[PDB]
Amino acid sequence: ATPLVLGENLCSINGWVPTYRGEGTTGKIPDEQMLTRQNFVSCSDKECRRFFVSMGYGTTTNFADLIVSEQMNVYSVKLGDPPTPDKLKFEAVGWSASSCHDGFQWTVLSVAGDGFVSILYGGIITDTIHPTNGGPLRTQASSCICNDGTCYTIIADGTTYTASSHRLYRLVNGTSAGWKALDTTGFNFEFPTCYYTSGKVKCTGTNLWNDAKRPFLEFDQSFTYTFKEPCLGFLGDTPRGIDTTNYCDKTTTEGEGGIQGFMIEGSNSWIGRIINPGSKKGFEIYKFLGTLFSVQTVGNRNYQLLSNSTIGRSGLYQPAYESRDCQELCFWIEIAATTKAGLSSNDLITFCGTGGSMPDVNW
Amino acid sequence: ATPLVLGENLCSINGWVPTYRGEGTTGKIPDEQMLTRQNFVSCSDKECRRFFVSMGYGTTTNFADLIVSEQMNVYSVKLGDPPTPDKLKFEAVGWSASSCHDGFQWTVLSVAGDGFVSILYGGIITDTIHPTNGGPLRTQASSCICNDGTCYTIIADGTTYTASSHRLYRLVNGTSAGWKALDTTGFNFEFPTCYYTSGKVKCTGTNLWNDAKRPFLEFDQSFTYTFKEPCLGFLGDTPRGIDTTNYCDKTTTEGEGGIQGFMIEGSNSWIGRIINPGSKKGFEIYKFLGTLFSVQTVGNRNYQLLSNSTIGRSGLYQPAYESRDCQELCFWIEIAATTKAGLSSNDLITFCGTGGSMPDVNW
Amino acid sequence: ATPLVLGENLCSINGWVPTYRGEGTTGKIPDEQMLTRQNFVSCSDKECRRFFVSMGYGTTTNFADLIVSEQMNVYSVKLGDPPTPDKLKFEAVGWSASSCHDGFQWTVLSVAGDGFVSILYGGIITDTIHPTNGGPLRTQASSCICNDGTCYTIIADGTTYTASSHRLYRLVNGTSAGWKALDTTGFNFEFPTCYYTSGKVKCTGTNLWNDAKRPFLEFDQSFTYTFKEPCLGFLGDTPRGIDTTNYCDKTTTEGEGGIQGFMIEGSNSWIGRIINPGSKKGFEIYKFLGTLFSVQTVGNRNYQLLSNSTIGRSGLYQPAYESRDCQELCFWIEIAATTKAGLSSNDLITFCGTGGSMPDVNW
Amino acid sequence: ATPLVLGENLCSINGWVPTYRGEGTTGKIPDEQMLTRQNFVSCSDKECRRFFVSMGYGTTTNFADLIVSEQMNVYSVKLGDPPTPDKLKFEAVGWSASSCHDGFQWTVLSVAGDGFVSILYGGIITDTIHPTNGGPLRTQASSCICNDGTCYTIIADGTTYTASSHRLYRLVNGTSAGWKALDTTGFNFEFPTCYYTSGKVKCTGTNLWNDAKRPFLEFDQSFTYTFKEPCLGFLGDTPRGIDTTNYCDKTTTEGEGGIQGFMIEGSNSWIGRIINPGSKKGFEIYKFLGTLFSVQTVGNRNYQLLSNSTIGRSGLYQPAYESRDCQELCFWIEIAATTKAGLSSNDLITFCGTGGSMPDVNW
Ligand SMILES: *[C@@H]1O[C@H](CO)[C@@H](O)[C@H](O)[C@H]1NC(C)=O
Ligand SMILES: *[C@@H]1O[C@H](CO)[C@@H](O)[C@H](O)[C@H]1NC(C)=O
Ligand SMILES: *[C@@H]1O[C@H](CO)[C@@H](O)[C@H](O)[C@H]1NC(C)=O
Ligand SMILES: *[C@@H]1O[C@H](CO)[C@@H](O)[C@H](O)[C@H]1NC(C)=O
Ligand SMILES: [Ca+2]
Ligand SMILES: [Ca+2]
Ligand SMILES: [Ca+2]
Ligand SMILES: [Ca+2]
Ligand SMILES: [Ca+2]
């Protein structure tokens, strides 16, 4: 085994094709399946896995019950496999999780009991992190980023989003190798969703407090970091008011509330978003020439990927292969499902970028 | 791993013995199984796999619904395994698929969304192919042929069969390495089912337009190709009128409509067909001394392999082993099933050729 | 991998302990399980497998139907695993089967269609055997014996048991390496169940014609063979009349009918049998000092292994390990079950010999 | 493979974090799962397994039936997997079991039929042990201890607890390599639960006769052994009266009855116990500076791990890895469950020690 190394240069992306689609994205879910929530995807050098948080089996769960965070566990499955009892791999106990593969073992961060974080490397507990700022900690709920055997993840603390604190942790073989406070003051940065290019990790957060755009974060291996705010009238977050003119300030109108989502910075740049913030129906992703951080930059192409489906969280992931100089970039989108008889499991659909332009398709 | 090399010389075939039979070919299907359609078989050097297109699970599907191509996904399973959720391997999104293993990875061609073709090599998307002549593209719906690390497949374009266009593609490690237009004019050539011998690939198509016989195609690595029409009163296609005298022309009577099926050219030659084109009941295969392309050649032995079973598509496949100088040849046949309560999944039965003659048997 | 070599010297056996017990031997069988018949056990150097013939799934099968040999298929499972759809390994098509592992692949003999035998080595069809003496052939329905990379099995031919013919086949890497006709005249020898010791294979047959004792057969690698008849008033077969005095003739009273069962020849010798031939209840095994072929020899110890259970076929098998100079010997016994709602699947219990004496136990 | 070697020095334990939790510990159990009893955990160098004794499947079992020891079988599963039919591994026939992995194979001791003990090494029967003192034998119902390729286990004999006898057995590659009678007179010592440190094995028994504290046992490779009685007013057993002053005698009040549980002796020492002996609700573990065997020693910290759950047996186990000089120590607790419709399966929750102090949590 060899430390996971990611490609320094990103693939040109001009289009998107689905690489995976759960069976609940179209039909109903069999009752025997585990009910999932907080799905995401994270890849090893061998394969891509779908992590999630269990709500219990659909058959042993009655509708009248609301189920509760303390009862929740973190499971894994191979992306492409359905969450049947036999496919499930128990990962840890918790109601929130993030994970990444360094090239040796899986590192998994879970939030449990009190609201602290267990860190487990290859299934065994190597470290715990405790809340200072009070109230429960919170993980990215997205793949963390490993490069050269050290992994980077962002952890949130605090009673409310008005009062949140965020630390950027560095992990090695499952133990914390230090961290840095991120200066958040005046705004809020939750559920960051991240990728790596050109020696820097680039994360799209979610502002649940005072913002209908998405804060953006750049940092490198030495923890020198800057927050950037996108200067485009295309509002990523949900809910949100209305599209605006471009400006490098933050859009405070309907800024409160939010759901996890991404933006991609590159040669081409992308913003994905929920189409109808009322009904939560549809998902669109939208292309831009040059940076998201210039007020100068121009909308080009809008792909309405999903129309008929109730959408929620979305996030990025990078699969790792020899491939070539090119680093592939993919993203997932969680979708409302229902069990054969009621119940609100979610399922996944994933897209990968192609260099080619693509035709208009509703999946 | 070593590039898949097929035997230059074909095994003498004088009979057929079944090597596999789905549980739906006899009893009813358990509701928890995935409903399948467009089944075929393709072999690696390690094993044979059964590909198919999902209609959803039988328990989560209600009868009153008709299901639709856009919801459909291409799965794989090991031949001999039943399509339980735990056995399935997600392969791609699409409503039509063909595949073949080059000795390294599986190549899979799927048709999805707009009606274009994704090509995926070892599960990742390496290439796409888009329709020029308009309307959806169409795959062999049969194993494609790999020899020496390059794979050959045939792709159909066009709004209607009167107007169809066919390209013969060449693929390497999942990217297209060029193609050639096949001259189809005056006829139509769908769902080719192919094998390899004596330095040539030989494919039996299905003419859905103006023919009750089956077009036949020979081509080699340099894409020099010729279409041949069989000169025998034994009508392959379905439906069809009646058996005729031998002639090297095409039988236009009841030539319209059709279903996928094969012919074998060799020392001994074979034509398989559905017995009762009205009821679609029964499958017979029929031996001939010498070519199918001489008007001279004589019927010899008729094997009625299936009598009690409702039949549909049929196709060839070559398993690959060291074995000997001899290249084994097998074929599958798709059979109507039903779930434990209604629903029309299909199952497979497969036959392999033996050198020996065989007694009369209804399987 | 190395050619399977069996121990020349047999373990001293003075008692029996169960090593495995199906869940149907106690409670009822879950409807989703495959219904089995003609269960037996055969071991590789890696593991022991349970072979059987399917009657279909218990949920998809209705009671009013009687199911038929032509619909039957041969499955394998790992001994200790239940025949769930996910555990099943399709082995061949047929209603009767025998198998043995040579140290490289599994050899399986199946009887199908016309009533001929397919021979498959490692899942592929290497050879077929056809009936001369008319009517369907018949396999041991018990593990065949492999030693030093050649395998030995016994095949029956003939319209009725009055008129049976038996050949002793030799197989290598799945092809027949010849056979010998066994001189059966005047009696009948079905379902032989065999083991290997002291350079000789020793088979206990079942006489369905004119005998309430069990024919016994000795042969070696060169196919020199003798039939012996046990000279003991303990009647192995079922049904049977009554226990007799000892004589080296054959007991013709109630000699007709029969069911597969064994005898063990050694320092100690064993005869196992169904206790109550009327109700088919119970199974006892019974120890003897010295040979079964001397009228001199004395009953010693009677173990009543099963009392409450409806019994049927029983057979031997030798597991292979390094262990020591000692060759272990075990046997299985097939037991009537019922599905959660009617239906007559069978399950297995197996016993292995220990050197120690054992207490009286009803399992 | 290499003989399993355990760490001489124990990890400092100042807190406990759950590493696994069964789905029945929170929700209801799906009916298709096997009903379990006598759960425990034992680890190999590869993985930890969960052993248990089957009551049959939840779907095929009706409530009105009480099920009986003779029908019971010993299964295994990988810790973290659910006891679905497809996950189960058949281990032996019996109603009571203990197991441990020496570094080569699993050794499993089972009690069946008459009440004797089968010993199976790597799934094959290597030895049996019979009762002298009459009445059924009994196993630890807990992981036995392997170190350097020899394994140690404790076996109970006798009609009643007033009259019990206990031998300490030594096993190698599955055969008994001798034993020693433990001097129990005047008390009783059942279901010992054990770990290894500092060249000694340390076991916490349960006195079902005359004691509300828990006997404690120290022995080494040469079988030199001493019984110690803990000198602390914290009563381990259940039921029990009331907490007392500290003294080195045994607490006779409500001494009768009992259930399996543990104590840890170390730098820090621990007693775990059921919180409310009436209702059997809740589990607390309690920390002590220095030995449990001095009247001098002081309660320090009480962790209430479980509050809302009905508790039963609890036991230790040591997972084995390279880790470091530190030998990890974990324990499991069995918890009442219920199937989707009635029935009293049990599930597991396991805790591992951390060096760090931990916050108060109700899991
Ligand atoms: C982490 O483990 C890798 C192999 O897993 C090893 O090469 C490296 O030295 C380890 N790093 C630390 C900080 O222990
Ligand atoms: C195709 O793949 C094989 C490895 O499977 C490799 O050695 C060869 O370089 C590849 N050729 C091309 C054109 O990609
Ligand atoms: C059979 O295969 C073995 C290896 O399994 C080989 O060594 C031997 O030469 C083979 N013989 C025949 C006749 O196929
Ligand atoms: C136990 O097993 C190992 C091989 O795995 C062997 O070398 C060792 O000698 C055995 N010990 C005994 C007492 O048989
Ligand atoms: Ca917002
Ligand atoms: Ca036609
Ligand atoms: Ca399963
Ligand atoms: Ca008889
Ligand atoms: Ca007590």
Author numbering:
A (entry chain D), B (entry chain A), C (entry chain C), D (entry chain B): 75 to 437
Provide text from the study:
The extensive sequence divergence of A/bat/Peru/10 NAL from the recently characterized N10 prompted us to determine its X-ray structure in two crystal forms at 2.68 Å and 3.0 Å. The N11 NAL forms a typical “box-shaped” tetramer, containing six four-stranded, antiparallel β-sheets in a propeller-like arrangement. Comparison of the A/bat/Peru/10 NAL monomer with other NA structures reveals surprising similarity despite low sequence identity (29.6%). In addition, a calcium required for stabilization of all known influenza A and B NA active sites is conserved in N11 NAL. Taken together, the N11 NAL and the N10 NAL are homologous proteins characterized by highly diverged putative active sites. Among the eight conserved charged and polar residues that interact with substrate in all other influenza A and B subtypes, only Arg118, Arg224, Glu276 are conserved (N2 numbering) as in N10 NALs. Arg292 and Arg371, critical for sialic acid binding, are replaced in A/bat/Peru/10 NAL by Thr and Lys, respectively. The N11 NAL active site pocket is much wider than other flu A and B NAs, including 1918 N1, due mainly to 150- and 430-loop movements. The glycerol moiety of a canonical sialic acid, as observed in other flu A and B NA structures, would clash with the N11 NAL active site. N11 NAL catalyzes extremely low levels of sialic acid cleavage as observed for N10 NAL, and similar to H18 HA, N11 NAL exhibited no binding to 610 diverse natural glycans including sialosides in a glycan microarray assay.
